[PDB]
Design a protein around this ligand. Sequence first.
Ligand SMILES: CC[C@H]1OC(=O)/C=C/[C@H](C)[C@@H](O[C@@H]2O[C@H](C)C[C@H](N(C)C)[C@H]2O)[C@@H](C)C[C@@H](C)C(=O)/C=C/C=C/[C@@H]1CO[C@@H]1O[C@H](C)[C@@H](O)[C@@H](O)[C@H]1O
Ligand SMILES: CC[C@H]1OC(=O)/C=C/[C@H](C)[C@@H](O[C@@H]2O[C@H](C)C[C@H](N(C)C)[C@H]2O)[C@@H](C)C[C@@H](C)C(=O)/C=C/C=C/[C@@H]1CO[C@@H]1O[C@H](C)[C@@H](O)[C@@H](O)[C@H]1O
Ligand SMILES: Nc1ncnc2c1ncn2[C@@H]1O[C@H](CSCC[C@H](N)C(=O)O)[C@@H](O)[C@H]1O
Ligand SMILES: Nc1ncnc2c1ncn2[C@@H]1O[C@H](CSCC[C@H](N)C(=O)O)[C@@H](O)[C@H]1O
Ligand SMILES: Nc1ncnc2c1ncn2[C@@H]1O[C@H](CSCC[C@H](N)C(=O)O)[C@@H](O)[C@H]1O
Ligand SMILES: [Mg+2]
Ligand SMILES: [Mg+2]
Ligand SMILES: [Mg+2]
Lengths: 393, 386, 350, 366
Amino acid sequence: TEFDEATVQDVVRLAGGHDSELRELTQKYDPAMISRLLVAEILSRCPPPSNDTPVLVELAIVHGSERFRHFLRVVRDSPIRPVGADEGFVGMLVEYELTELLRELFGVTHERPAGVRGTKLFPYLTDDEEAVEQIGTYLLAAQQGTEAVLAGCGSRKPDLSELSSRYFTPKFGFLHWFTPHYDRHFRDYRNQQVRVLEIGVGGYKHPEWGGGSLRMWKSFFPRGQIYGLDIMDKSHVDELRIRTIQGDQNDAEFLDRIARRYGPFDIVIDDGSHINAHVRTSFAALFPHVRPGGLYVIEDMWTAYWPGFGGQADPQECSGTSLGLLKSLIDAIQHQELPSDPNRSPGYVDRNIVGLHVYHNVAFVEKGRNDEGGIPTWIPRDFESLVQASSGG
Amino acid sequence: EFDEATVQDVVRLAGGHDSELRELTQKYDPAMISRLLVAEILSRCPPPSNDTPVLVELAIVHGSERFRHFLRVVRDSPIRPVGADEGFVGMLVEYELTELLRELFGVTHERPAGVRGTKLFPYLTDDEEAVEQIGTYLLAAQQGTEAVLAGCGSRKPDLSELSSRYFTPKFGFLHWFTPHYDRHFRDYRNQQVRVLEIGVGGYKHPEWGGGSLRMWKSFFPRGQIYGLDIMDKSHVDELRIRTIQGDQNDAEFLDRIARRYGPFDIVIDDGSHINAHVRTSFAALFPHVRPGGLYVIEDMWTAYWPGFGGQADPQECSGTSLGLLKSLIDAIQHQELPSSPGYVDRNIVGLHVYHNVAFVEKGRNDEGGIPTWIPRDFESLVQASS
Amino acid sequence: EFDEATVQDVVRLAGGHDSELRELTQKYDPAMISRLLVAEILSRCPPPSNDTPVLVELAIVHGSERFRHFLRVVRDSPIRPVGADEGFVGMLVEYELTELLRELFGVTHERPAGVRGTKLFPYLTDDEEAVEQIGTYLLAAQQGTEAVLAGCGSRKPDLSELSSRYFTPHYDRHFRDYRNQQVRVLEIGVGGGSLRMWKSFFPRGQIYGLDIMDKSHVDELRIRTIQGDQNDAEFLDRIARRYGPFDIVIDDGSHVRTSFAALFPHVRPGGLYVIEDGTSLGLLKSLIDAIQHQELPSDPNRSPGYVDRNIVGLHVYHNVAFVEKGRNDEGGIPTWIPRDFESLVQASSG
Amino acid sequence: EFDEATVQDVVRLAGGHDSELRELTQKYDPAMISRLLVAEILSRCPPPSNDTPVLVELAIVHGSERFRHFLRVVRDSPIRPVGADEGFVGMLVEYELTELLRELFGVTHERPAGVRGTKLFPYLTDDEEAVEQIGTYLLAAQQGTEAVLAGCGSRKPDLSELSSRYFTPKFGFLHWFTPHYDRHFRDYRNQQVRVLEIGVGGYKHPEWGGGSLRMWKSFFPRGQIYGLDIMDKSHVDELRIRTIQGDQNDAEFLDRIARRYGPFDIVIDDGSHINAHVRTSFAALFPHVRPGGLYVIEDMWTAYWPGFGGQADPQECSGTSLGLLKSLIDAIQHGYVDRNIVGLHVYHNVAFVEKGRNDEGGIPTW
Ligand SMILES: CC[C@H]1OC(=O)/C=C/[C@H](C)[C@@H](O[C@@H]2O[C@H](C)C[C@H](N(C)C)[C@H]2O)[C@@H](C)C[C@@H](C)C(=O)/C=C/C=C/[C@@H]1CO[C@@H]1O[C@H](C)[C@@H](O)[C@@H](O)[C@H]1O
Ligand SMILES: CC[C@H]1OC(=O)/C=C/[C@H](C)[C@@H](O[C@@H]2O[C@H](C)C[C@H](N(C)C)[C@H]2O)[C@@H](C)C[C@@H](C)C(=O)/C=C/C=C/[C@@H]1CO[C@@H]1O[C@H](C)[C@@H](O)[C@@H](O)[C@H]1O
Ligand SMILES: Nc1ncnc2c1ncn2[C@@H]1O[C@H](CSCC[C@H](N)C(=O)O)[C@@H](O)[C@H]1O
Ligand SMILES: Nc1ncnc2c1ncn2[C@@H]1O[C@H](CSCC[C@H](N)C(=O)O)[C@@H](O)[C@H]1O
Ligand SMILES: Nc1ncnc2c1ncn2[C@@H]1O[C@H](CSCC[C@H](N)C(=O)O)[C@@H](O)[C@H]1O
Ligand SMILES: [Mg+2]
Ligand SMILES: [Mg+2]
Ligand SMILES: [Mg+2]
């Protein structure tokens, strides 16, 4: 909407810096625009409210003498939205300095249990005949309302399992159990300004469904930029820090173009067509654009056993399956151990895979320089010889 | 030395609450337990860096009894107990027995202070006496004390550093394993793990070997370590480390030691590297890994070498360790096969492959395959999901 | 309901290795243990967020035995055991008894898979007239199962979220490292939401709540309330001897000098005395001197008190302070160190 | 040898994403960065443990260029670059420049593999000659490589161990501070911190001091360390450590340097221990501590001793460091200081003060 992608990215980049970068940021961009950007981001981070009684939390973003006042309406079963100053009972004033709020949302920072904000309970309540009866009405509501808003004003790791039920995406709960693995592999990336590409947005031909996992990744990586690729148009999903791209997963040249434009990627996820040949095309085309230390993730390898997706009944005939790829990746890892051959060159994947993690219906591939060196030729090539050479006479 | 059953029981109770610490110190003689802890501390101290030799007095206190131990600390030598007069005593360190038990073998949070008492230059009566000793001993006492105290706790060691300390080829020259081991193993450090490593080291050399067993002992403060080797390795044995003599290719014998000493949280194969041996040991010992545990295969490079029973062609993997790992991918996905699963099928939940080392996760593989009513064709799936 | 000493024995054994878990299952009846785990599971489950009511079957298996439990899971209502008839079973969840013990009360690493079995729509015959049921129960069964599964583990909860369901960021900082221990927690001053909060946060814990009023209705698994006078030093010593020693004591200001003097001695070394919300302020200041007492000039006339010898840390925040129990015996600065600045310069310059 | 502004810029860009690392390598000569990283690695290497001396070749690669450094590695000697002919080359270690940047100065997750390339016994032609050298060099090579590689990353060091290594009294004889420092400082380690320690060490002695400065440099891989001392300690200055000469009891002077070098994430007072000095420094420097930062006071023991402006009576605390701490307790429950203290942590002879607005949980008193 208002917020240009390069600008959001620049803001996140500077927010991760020290004092000089924070000053630089607020000098480079209008403080009113930045405060607007933070509110939009906060509205996305807030968990569902639990309070039965509608309440207003006032979020005051302060910069020098300027106060950008946002009155957030908070109630169970309604998205948290900004309203007019008079449109409810202000249960809590929450105050942040602009640079502090930037650090909390987009910074590289340590946990801060206190000292980031100021709060005042029932800020506009005057001592009247109505006062005490109004305190009974609102005390719990103000507390719960505030909890929800405060949780949106920071970068505490969300629970992926919970986000999958919240954003309506099949990662955990019924058909799959991916999220605890995703958590283990992804959580160490959360300090970084990651670029994440997911192939397959969701909902298929439905004019409204999809983008659940995309929103999941936005919540999980507070400093990330998420991209979604789908053969269908999913522009209705675009929001702050989420970009949807329309194209074919099995078009390698096109994959190369978008990776050049938007890459390189810390993380690529394949959850698209699940057609076996597609997975192989996507991987060969997109693995070179994963950063060293990044991950390439393949979901739903179950289609490797099925003809309707270009797979095979017999698990042994894994010629062109996604499982065949995984198996071959083991040899790619071990490639420096092959008997020397003056004609053979290690392929690109050979040189660039350093780990493979395989779980039920999900596999993680580690991108890295695979150049540890094979076992020297002067270590004997049979067991009884090795014993002799290792027994120190 | 100390009976294994006793050592394991002490570790068990040290991991409990106040009632268990009482039970422990009433079941066994406090004098006996003190010598056990000191033995442990000796193997736990990092190598000292002080140039001038110093004594750290460790006094272990229980009730009215006070057990005094004098540790000689100097660089290039191992820390060892000596008599009270056999050096300058730079530091007195005092522990309650139950507190020392907690720090060495407990299930405990990190405690930055209040676990001990300390008295510097303890036997220097007069001030003028201490002043003349600052030049010679202040630094030395500080460095010596630092090393002993490191031996008196449970702080996680650096496995890559241990590789160099204990002369094991796990990191730094032929291999680069230790960062993978750290990632996979560190969350077990609380537990009274039982670890089996196949291959003690040294082969037929009469002295060498056991470096990796000493590594695991350091890394797992509450663990029992077992090493298997075809050659006698009795000289490696020490508190919390037992060597077993036998053939990793004898499936009956492996069942025997598994039943005697298991079940294992962790098994590591770093033995002959003969492809068949690797397969025999996996089939025999995998059933004896606890759910949530790990089976680790090292040095799969031999999969490509016929002198180890491997094949030069990676596609001809039917008899190799790599062929096994590939078969394990199918095991993980087994419930996705069209319409009995074997033991391994039902019990593998993760595979991690790195250069020359693979970790296998033992667990109930029973998430359920993709249900019948989900379409088995791409075109069919698209219309059903809209 | 369940015998306290038994519950503690179960939790003690659950935190061991294989021989302790088999001891557990031999020592006590597997059906009893089963009801205890379910009882515990119901206390941990988050409030469900699914609109269409669904049943989750929890099958607990020990050898030849199988204990089934059908749990009603719907929004705005607590998860409750029900009869198999009284709703639609959307998910079967299956645990080995010993594995569930490990997950709820064990000392264990995080295990992202392999702890259970799952069968989606466990009792559906064919697809000829049973797709209409698939169309409305798919999303609810996923959300309902997510809530049950969260009750079946020991994932650290959010104390902020627990405060709403039943400030806290400082409690998390100081309390979280204790979570795999079989702690004993005493809260002074108790609605018993606060005790239910610590129960949730300490999966292996025993919680005790002291109050002058009878609060026996608050009692449940791993929560006992004690009734008596918080201003009576002797009584406090007596209940500490009985139920202690405590890893953590939480003392509300709404007094303190009395309860702190009587109870600090019963805090475990490495434990915490927590003071929430004049009287309190003065005590905190003095604790600074208690920490520094080995630095006082010597006097055979003044001798260090219990607290002096036993405090190793003070953490003071807005309306809450944490006092670290431990041996305060590091040694004071030795006499041979100069006691004015100019002399310290000289003696420290080679 | 390296410009302090340039180093801080390099650390800042290193902690960014791909486009920042590209920017880094365009902005500065890659040769120069190579020397800077090697310099950094040399101070991060633990003491080596190999008996037989060995050479570890560090090759840093950018695009086409290859910068080769040969490091001598032997017990009791510091790792230093020497010619290719001054020993046996045990190991070739190879880094892409931007990858090494990331490993040393980046904001990065832990990477157990794929950050480098390694070639053992790299200049031995045939197999028969290499077998000859197993008995002499293999173990030496492994141990040497391990020491170098330890200095090529950012693994949290052990402060207690650094205390013995760098000769500072923070742990092991007079004090037991380091486990507290570790708990309070460890979460700051991926931030480009600015650390100011009052008291460099060594006093009038012409060589001693700097121990603790080197400690912080080692502990904070992206940090800039500053040390203030009344005496001149210019011999201590190295990459990422600057020493400043001046009096801690000169409020105006402190404000002057706090504006030049601040704001600080951490300030540590281990200076004169004169009680008035401690209170002057705090009042002057606390305003320049960043929100979420720490002010640390060491050696409050002098609060009891008149020779440092203290008092034997713990109740006569009005002008002592203890008295200051006690009034910090008041501020936390309600001057600049009052509105900006959110936490106090007191341990034997060391206190940690948390900086942040004590503005939270306000209620209308009526
Ligand atoms: C020929 C091949 C053999 O090389 C040796 O035996 C070298 C022995 C050295 C000479 C020893 O150093 C001596 O220690 C003395 C105490 C003082 C000595 N000196 C300083 C007086 C000092 O020189 C070692 C003890 C040093 C440590 C690093 C070590 O354990 C090395 C083991 C090397 C094993 C390989 C076989 O590896 C196996 O097969 C495959 C290659 C792989 O599968 C691999 O994983 C493994 O399973
Ligand atoms: C007399 C008091 C003075 O003692 C000294 O000066 C002792 C100097 C040693 C003799 C040095 O060792 C020498 O290093 C040579 C390079 C090789 C030498 N050898 C092996 C050939 C070797 O002997 C030190 C460098 C060793 C390290 C541990 C160190 O830094 C010790 C500092 C001690 C400072 C105290 C004053 O402390 C201050 O005042 C308060 C008491 C406290 O508040 C305190 O915190 C502090 O602020
Ligand atoms: N060849 C192809 N290229 C790109 N996208 C494709 C494709 N075939 C199918 N898709 C898209 O991939 C999606 C599969 S569903 C993706 C689920 C989503 N990632 C989530 O977790 O919520 C569908 O929306 C479909 O439109
Ligand atoms: N069939 C067999 N059964 C058991 N051990 C065997 C074996 N064949 C060889 N070994 C042993 O396996 C060892 C391999 S070396 C072990 C190295 C050790 N893990 C370390 O890292 O330090 C040798 O000591 C050898 O004696
Ligand atoms: N008024 C003053 N201003 C600044 N520095 C002072 C001072 N009075 C003394 N000092 C210096 O403070 C230092 C105290 S020793 C510092 C020890 C060092 N921090 C370490 O941990 O190793 C001495 O070097 C002394 O010269
Ligand atoms: Mg999917
Ligand atoms: Mg090996
Ligand atoms: Mg000092």
